[PDB]
């Protein structure tokens, strides 16, 4: 039921709202106002994208989707079966997520712990309102957002991207994708230097912060040092969306030609014309 | 005929699919979720699922001797005070006392070893500036000896007399100051520490609760469940610094 | 909030630490120096450096691959210097255009891009000597080396594993800016649409995956900064109330947890499974299944929608239509 | 660097599957303004004498047109194509039949390729037609031709740079990039797909296991050919103004039915016309036209689909003179 540790945290107290109301736990979930509001809008969201489906053509997990309304209904709301069950479960989508932040700041405040995991977490809520809300609400469509289907919003990512013919010269898509590779690199020697300190096999000794930083400054001239690294980790990865959502809004509302004759701002110049 | 194309409408990528996930479900269950399971299992409430979800015991050869092997059998026999607000299992705790004395709740401690923590060379790895003569405050940066250190009621508790470097990794962890009206020496962690030019803001525990922040056995060296002690005391002052603290903040 | 999880508010100056390893200490050149600027959001000291065997013929090899990729550059603007900086990114060493099979095309058409490729893998197993060496020198284990060696796999799969097993050079990806891009789009148009390929979507779950795992670590070690979370080796050998309060922050929040070591096995299989994902999807990709969306479509996956405009019947089927 | 909102955007395929046009206001305005100028249809003359077959001495194409029906057509062919030259363009002014001049000869097979083109290819210009209009917009050069390398600027009308000149070798890759809407695709579409039929644009295969028999080895295509239909694709939509979705699914480049458009099957036809137009009418007027018109292997310029389109989807936004001028076909 309770980890050996644990006891001894299991305090009261540590709300944003509801106080005593629904400060407990169940078995080892936390629930709060937020953990009942989360509860709420998955049943709700779950529930609605099940009905959906079943009045479309297959049960077939990978092919199901339910897809958001025609670009001629703008922001207004549409009929259930052309674009409505999305618009409800697009709203229980983020009532879930924001409410499953708000619950981490909780847990966090009865653990007298700092709140950069909720605040890490606002990054991927804030890079789906960008796609699903703000560029929609730019274009003046719901019907510009992408669809709930594991294959279907994939079909839409690769449609959005051929819209401007080469999605790879993006600007913001550089930046984001260079991101993405570099923190999956970075986790790689994070996670493996660490193993390899407690870890040096044959019955050898666990090894110490300085060998940490001396394996680096060995092989790169530099260590970054054992607290840095995380804060650079929670930078790295936050940028892969911090910087792709300025690709994804700009694409329609600030541009509407390929990505690659952007960078005729710098081929064009006279000067080597 | 067809490259990949197998017997039965099978193909190899289809097998390969299977393939994979299988590779990945043994790795992340049994291996992985297996590895979780080093520290605090057994849980409190001996069935074979107790059994089943440990790995096998690791003995970590520690670099200045002696072994550590998890996981291993640790009981909290410490006793907590703590009572149960509501007969519900999942029901919360409340302190029975003052909660950061007691060291409950965010106020908690973990049992950590009573050993001082070491350099590679075996000396101590924490240790105060006075201790510590050849290491120095970088040029550009605030001093805060002499400073004074104001709490979270803007009452000045005390005056900074040290700081405290960890020697293996060339960072400052603690400032030490004396409390003021209460005859002792106290720490603090850096990361409670708002440093400014003229003052060490504080908004982690009231002005009168720094006569109890923990106190060290030694003057110039600290153990690790000491510097648990220090943090811990602070972190606790983040909810019970006021009764205002535990409740609702909306 | 906790400053110190920002940047450094009071900088640490000490005498420089040198770790002995097994040999290579006299290899070891530069005067360390120190940035203020770099010492508020990492460590100050920049420097030494170690040489040794290995990294200098990674340099060696390296530097003999660049230059052949330059040079060609070069000629592909006729060697004008204002031209080269103006159009880089457009510029490119591609390899054979002609259907060689696995004949060793001629230098002008794909011959330069195959020593540019022999080069550079020269260079990737020098330097992944040096990263397991280091290790073992500096008595630690060789989990960097073996995570390096799935990254070096997958760029040897697209560069020379995949050609030789489909019997082309053509295949191979091109050196250049621009240009190993425009490569992407060959690749998944070619075998009918990547999105398709379970293997893409395995290592974009672990890509996108490592994004999720290193945000939530790097920020729950901040979080648990105040108590010495930062300190990962000793709270492994010895638990301390920074591991038991990041454990029970997500015990709470998704009904499991980790330990301070386990996450770390955690990011390095999530990162490696990146390049294992990929290499097993590439070394599929025209071998075993040619069209990955019409592979979708035989099992029973793909999703289908209603025509919007009306549905448009091939005209190069149509009765009398031209060839 | 960037253009300012609103965007107008339409939609081409399946709710959800972000398919359709993306278009910038001042740009579509901009061009509808260019694309205006063409001339107004001349006022209708009723057919009148006996046909000019009988009248005139040197007529082969238009002989059963009465003169003012065939006086009015080459008023028409003046303002299309030398406006600003005149008749004497074509013609000695002291003999009217006179074929001294060479473009009096290209003329005439000109008149043979429109009407052609209106009676043969409908499944491409359907009722909307071509005239000599189209391609020339009132110069005797069409602004968008293409010879057998790359050429800038794209719009001839325009003086190019240096380096933009084709004998300036160091600008070889630009000329390449904005024939491809600035990619680095490094293949000229052009040649090896519109100027003749001996290329397969298709690369993608039509099963989801490779075929024993043409997938090892030199049995293959190289991917070098999935690239150029890149670079031919790259080249269509700037062509037209637009992009892929305006006639795929990218779920399934390779896909007919609900995988595409109806434009889809009209860019299709294109091709082929483009091909017919370029192999059996333009490639061999390097015999009748003056060595400072051909490109620098001796070839006559030719035609691709923005020769036409102008970066507009449908050539004009649709205008049609085809009613108005009868000659130009379709010929019954
Ligand atoms: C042909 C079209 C292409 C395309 C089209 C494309 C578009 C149109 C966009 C990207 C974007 C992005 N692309 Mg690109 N792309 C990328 C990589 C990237 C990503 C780094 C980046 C951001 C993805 C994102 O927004 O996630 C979003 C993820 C979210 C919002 C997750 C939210 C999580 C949520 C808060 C919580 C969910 C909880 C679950 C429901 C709960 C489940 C319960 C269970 C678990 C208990 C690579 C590496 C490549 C390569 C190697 O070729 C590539 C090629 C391509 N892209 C093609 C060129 N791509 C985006 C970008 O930033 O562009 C600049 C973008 O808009
Ligand atoms: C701008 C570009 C985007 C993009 C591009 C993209 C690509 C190109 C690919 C995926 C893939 C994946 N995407 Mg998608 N995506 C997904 C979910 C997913 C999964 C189906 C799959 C694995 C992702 C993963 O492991 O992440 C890391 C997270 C981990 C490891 C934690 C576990 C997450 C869990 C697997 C998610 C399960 C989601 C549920 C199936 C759906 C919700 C269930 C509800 C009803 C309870 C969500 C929930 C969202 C939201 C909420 O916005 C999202 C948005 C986007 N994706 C953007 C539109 N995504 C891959 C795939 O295989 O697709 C079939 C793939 O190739
Ligand atoms: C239109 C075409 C597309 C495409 C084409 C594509 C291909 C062709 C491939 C991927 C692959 C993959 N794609 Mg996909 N893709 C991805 C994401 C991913 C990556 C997770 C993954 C692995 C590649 C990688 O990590 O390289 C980064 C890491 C690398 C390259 C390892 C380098 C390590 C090396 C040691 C570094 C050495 C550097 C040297 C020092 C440099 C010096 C050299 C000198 C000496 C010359 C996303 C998130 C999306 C979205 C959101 O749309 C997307 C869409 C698309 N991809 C489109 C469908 N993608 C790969 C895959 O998984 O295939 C099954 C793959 O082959
Ligand atoms: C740049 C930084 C990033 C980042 C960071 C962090 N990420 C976090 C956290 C942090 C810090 C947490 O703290 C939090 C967590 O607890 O971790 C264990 C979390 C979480 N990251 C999830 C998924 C995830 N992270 C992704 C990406 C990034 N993560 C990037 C890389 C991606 C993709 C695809 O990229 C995915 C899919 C969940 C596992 C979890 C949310 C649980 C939830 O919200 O519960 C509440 C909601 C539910 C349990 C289900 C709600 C169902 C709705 C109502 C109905 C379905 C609607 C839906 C729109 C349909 C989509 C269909 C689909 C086929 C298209
Ligand atoms: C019809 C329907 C759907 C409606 C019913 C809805 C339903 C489920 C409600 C049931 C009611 C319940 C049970 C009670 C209510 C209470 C409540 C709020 C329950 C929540 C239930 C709920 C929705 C559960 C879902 C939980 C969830 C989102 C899990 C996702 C897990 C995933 C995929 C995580 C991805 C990241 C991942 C690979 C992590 C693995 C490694 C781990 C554990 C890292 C965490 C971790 C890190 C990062 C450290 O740095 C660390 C450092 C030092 C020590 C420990 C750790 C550590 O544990
Ligand atoms: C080239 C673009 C031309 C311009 C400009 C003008 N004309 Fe023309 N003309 C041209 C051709 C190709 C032909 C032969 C048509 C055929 O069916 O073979 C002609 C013919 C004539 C004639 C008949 C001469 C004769 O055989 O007796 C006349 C009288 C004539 N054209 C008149 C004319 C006028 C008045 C023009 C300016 C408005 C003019 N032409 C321009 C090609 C071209
Ligand atoms: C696009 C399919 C075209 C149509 C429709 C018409 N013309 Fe054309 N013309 C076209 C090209 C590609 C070229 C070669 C480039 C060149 O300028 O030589 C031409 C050429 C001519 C010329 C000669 C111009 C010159 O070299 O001085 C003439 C006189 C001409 N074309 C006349 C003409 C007429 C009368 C048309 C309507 C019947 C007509 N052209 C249509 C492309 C296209
Ligand atoms: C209509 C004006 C189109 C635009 C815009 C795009 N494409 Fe296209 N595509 C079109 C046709 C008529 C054809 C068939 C050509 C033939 O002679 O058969 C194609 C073909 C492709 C293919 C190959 C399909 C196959 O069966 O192998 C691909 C991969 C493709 N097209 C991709 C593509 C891209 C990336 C586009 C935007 C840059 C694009 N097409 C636009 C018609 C049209
Ligand atoms: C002049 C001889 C043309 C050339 C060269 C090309 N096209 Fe064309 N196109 C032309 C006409 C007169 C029309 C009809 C316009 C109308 O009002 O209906 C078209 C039409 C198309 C379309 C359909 C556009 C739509 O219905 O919205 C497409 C997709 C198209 N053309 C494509 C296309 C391509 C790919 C070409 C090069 C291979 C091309 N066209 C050349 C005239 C001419
Ligand atoms: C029979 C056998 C033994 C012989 C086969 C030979 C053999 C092993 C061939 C292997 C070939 C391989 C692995 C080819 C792989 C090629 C790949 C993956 C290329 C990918 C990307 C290349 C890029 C982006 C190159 C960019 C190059 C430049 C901008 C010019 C070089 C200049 C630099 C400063 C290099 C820095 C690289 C980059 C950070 C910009
Ligand atoms: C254990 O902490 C770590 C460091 O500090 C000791 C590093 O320098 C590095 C190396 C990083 C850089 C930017 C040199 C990594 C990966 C790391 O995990
Ligand atoms: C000569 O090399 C180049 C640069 O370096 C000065 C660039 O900044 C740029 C512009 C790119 C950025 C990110 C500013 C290009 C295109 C380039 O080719
Ligand atoms: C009380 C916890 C410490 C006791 C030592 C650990 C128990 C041994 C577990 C053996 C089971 C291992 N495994 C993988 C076979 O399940
Ligand atoms: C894959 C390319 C291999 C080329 C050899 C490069 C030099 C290797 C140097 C080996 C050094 C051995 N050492 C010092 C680690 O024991
Ligand atoms: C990233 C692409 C993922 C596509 C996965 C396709 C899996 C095909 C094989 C299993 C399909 C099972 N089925 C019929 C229930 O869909
Ligand atoms: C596509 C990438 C797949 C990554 C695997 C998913 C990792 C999350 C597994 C959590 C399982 C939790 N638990 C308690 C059931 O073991
Ligand atoms: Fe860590």
């Given at each position: ?79 259930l079966l052309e674009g409505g069950f999305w618009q409800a479960i697009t709203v229980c989508a983020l009532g879930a997520f924001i409410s499953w932040m708000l619950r981490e700041v909780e847990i966090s405040r009865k653990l007298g712990i700092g709140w950069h995991v909720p605040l890490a977490f606002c990054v991927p809520i804030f890079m789906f309102c960008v796609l699903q809300v703000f560029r929609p609400l730019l274009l003046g469509s719901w019907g510009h957002a992408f669809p709930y289907g594991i294959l279907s919003h994939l079909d839409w990512v690769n449609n959005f991207g051929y819209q401007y013919l080469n999605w790879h010269y993006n600007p913001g898509h550089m930046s984001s994708v260079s991101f993405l590779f570099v923190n999956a690199m970075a986790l790689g020697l994070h996670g493996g230097l660490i ?79 | ?250 | ?323 | ?332």
């Amino acid at each position: 039921a309770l980890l050996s540790f644990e006891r001894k945290y299991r305090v009261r107290g540590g709300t944003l709202i509801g106080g005593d109301l629904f400060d407990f736990w169940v078995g080892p979930y936390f629930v709060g106002f937020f953990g009942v509001s989360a509860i709420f809008f998955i049943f709700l969201g779950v529930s609605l994208i099940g009905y959906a489906a079943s009045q479309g053509p297959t049960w077939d997990p990978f092919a199901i989707s339910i897809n958001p309304p025609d670009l001629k209904y703008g922001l207004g709301a549409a009929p259930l079966l052309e674009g409505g069950f999305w618009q409800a479960i697009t709203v229980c989508a983020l009532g879930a997520f924001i409410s499953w932040m708000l619950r981490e700041v909780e847990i966090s405040r009865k653990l007298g712990i700092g709140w950069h995991v909720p605040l890490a977490f606002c990054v991927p809520i804030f890079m789906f309102c960008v796609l699903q809300v703000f560029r929609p609400l730019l274009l003046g469509s719901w019907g510009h957002a992408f669809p709930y289907g594991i294959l279907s919003h994939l079909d839409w990512v690769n449609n959005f991207g051929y819209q401007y013919l080469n999605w790879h010269y993006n600007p913001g898509h550089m930046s984001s994708v260079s991101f993405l590779f570099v923190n999956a690199m970075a986790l790689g020697l994070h996670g493996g230097l660490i193993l390899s300190v407690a870890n040096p096999g044959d019955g050898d000794k666990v090894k110490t912060a300085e060998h940490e930083n001396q394996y680096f400054r060995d092989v790169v001239g530099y260590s970054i040092g054992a607290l840095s690294i995380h804060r650079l980790g929670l930078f790295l990865a936050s940028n892969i969306f911090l910087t792709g959502a300025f690709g994804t809004i700009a694409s329609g509302p600030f541009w509407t030609r390929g990505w690659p004759e952007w960078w005729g701002w710098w081929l064009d110049i006279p000067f080597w014309s | 005929m067809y490259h990949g194309a197998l017997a039965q409408h099978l193909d190899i990528a289809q097998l390969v699919w299977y393939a994979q996930w299988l590779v990945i479900w043994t790795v992340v269950l049994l291996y992985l979720r297996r590895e979780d399971r080093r520290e605090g299992y057994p849980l409190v409430e001996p069935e074979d699922g107790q059994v089943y979800e440990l790995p096998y015991p690791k003995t970590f050869v520690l670099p200045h001797g002696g072994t550590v092997t998890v996981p291993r059998r640790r009981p909290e026999t410490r006793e907590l005070k703590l009572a149960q607000t509501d007969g519900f299992e999942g029901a919360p705790l409340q302190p029975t006392g003052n909660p950061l004395v007691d060291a409950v709740g965010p106020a908690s401690y973990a049992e950590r070893a009573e050993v001082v923590d070491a350099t590679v060379d075996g000396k101590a790895k924490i240790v105060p500036l006075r201790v510590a003569t050849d290491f120095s405050i970088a040029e550009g940066d605030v001093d805060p000896r002499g400073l004074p250190v104001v709490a979270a009621d803007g009452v000045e508790a005390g005056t900074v007399t040290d700081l405290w470097v960890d020697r293996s990794e060339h960072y400052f962890r603690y400032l030490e100051l004396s409390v003021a009206g209460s005859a002792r020496t106290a720490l603090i962690p850096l990361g409670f520490c708002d440093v400014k030019k003229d003052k060490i803001v504080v908004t982690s525990i009231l002005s009168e609760q720094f006569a109890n922040v923990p106190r060290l056995q030694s003057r110039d060296q600290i153990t690790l469940r000491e510097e648990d002690k220090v943090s811990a005391y602070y972190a606790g002052g983040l909810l019970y610094a006021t009764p205002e603290r535990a409740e609702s903040l909306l | 909030a906790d400053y110190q999880t920002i940047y450094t508010q009071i900088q640490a100056r000490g005498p420089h630490i040198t770790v002995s390893g097994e040999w290579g200490d006299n290899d070891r050149v530069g005067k360390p120096f120190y940035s203020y600027w770099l010492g508020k959001i990492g460590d100050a000291q920049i420097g030494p450096i170690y040489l040794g065997a290995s990294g200098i013929a990674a340099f060696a090899f390296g530097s003999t691959a660049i230059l052949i990729i330059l040079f060609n550059m070069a000629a592909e603007v006729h060697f004008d210097p204002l031209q080269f900086f103006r159009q880089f990114f457009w510029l490119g060493l591609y390899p054979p255009k002609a259907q060689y099979g696995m004949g060793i095309p001629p230098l002008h058409d794909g011959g330069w891009w195959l020593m540019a490729g022999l080069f550079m893998t020269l260079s990737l197993g020098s330097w992944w000597i040096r990263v397991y060496s280091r290790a073992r020198a500096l008595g630690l284990g060789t989990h960097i080396a073996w995570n390096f060696a799935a990254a070096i796999f997958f760029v040897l799969c697209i560069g020379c594993i995949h050609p030789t097993l489909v019997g082309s050079w053509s295949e191979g990806v091109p050196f250049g800016i621009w240009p190993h891009i425009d490569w992407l789009t060959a690749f998944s148009i070619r075998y009918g649409n990547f999105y398709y390929c379970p293997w893409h979507g395995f290592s974009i779950g672990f890509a996108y995956g490592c994004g999720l795992l290193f945000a939530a670590h790097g920020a729950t070690i901040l979080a648990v900064a105040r108590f010495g979370g930062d300190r990962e080796i000793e709270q492994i050998t010895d638990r301390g109330t920074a591991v038991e309060r990041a454990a029970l922050f997500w015990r709470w929040t998704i009904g499991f947890n980790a330990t301070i070591e386990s996450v770390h096995r955690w990011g390095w299989f999530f990162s490696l499974m990146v390049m294992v994902s990929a290499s097993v999807g590439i070394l599929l990709t025209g071998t075993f299944v040619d069209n990955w969306y019409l592979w979708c479509v035989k099992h029973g996956a793909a999703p289908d929608y209603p025509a919007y405009l009306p549905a448009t019947p091939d005209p190069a089927s149509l009765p009398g239509a031209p060839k | 660097c960037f253009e300012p909102p609103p965007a107008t955007t339409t939609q081409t395929g399946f709710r959800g599957l972000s398919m359709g046009e993306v278009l910038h206001p001042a740009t579509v305005k901009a061009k509808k303004e260019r694309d205006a100028q063409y001339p107004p249809a001349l006022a209708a003359v009723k057919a009148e004498g006996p046909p000019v077959s009988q009248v005139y001495k040197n007529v082969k194409v238009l002989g059963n047109l009465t003169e003012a029906e065939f006086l009015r057509t080459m008023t028409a062919i003046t303002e299309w194509v030398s406006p600003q030259e005149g008749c004497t363009y074509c013609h000695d002014e002291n003999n009217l039949a006179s074929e001294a001049k060479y473009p009096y000869v290209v003329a005439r097979r000109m008149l043979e390729m429109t009407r052609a083109i209106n009676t043969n290819w409908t499944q491409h210009v359907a009722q909307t037609g071509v005239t000599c209009y189209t391609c020339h917009r009132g110069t005797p050069l069409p602004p968008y031709v293409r010879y057998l390398e790359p050429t800038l600027p794209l719009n001839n009308r325009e003086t190019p740079t240096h380096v933009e000149r084709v004998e300036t070798r160091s600008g070889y890759v630009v000329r390449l990039a904005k024939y491809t809407a600035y990619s680095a695709l490094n293949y000229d579409p052009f040649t090896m797909f519109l100027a003749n039929d001996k290329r397969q644009v298709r690369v993608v295969p039509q099963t989801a296991l490779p075929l024993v028999g043409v997938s090892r080895g030199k049995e293959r295509r190289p991917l070098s050919d999935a690239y150029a239909t890149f670079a031919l694709m790259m080249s269509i939509s700037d062509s037209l103004g637009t992009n892929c979705t305006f006639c795929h699914n990218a779920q399934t480049f390779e896909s007919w039915g609900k995988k595409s458009t109806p434009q889809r099957a009209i860019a299709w036809w294109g091709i082929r016309m483009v091909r017919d137009l370029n192999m059996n009418y333009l490639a061999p007027l390097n015999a009748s036209l003056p060595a400072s018109r051909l490109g620098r292997q001796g070839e006559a310029p030719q035609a691709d689909c923005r020769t036409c389109h102008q970066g507009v989807t449908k050539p004009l936004f649709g205008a049609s003179r085809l009613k108005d001028y009868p000659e130009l076909g379709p010929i019954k």
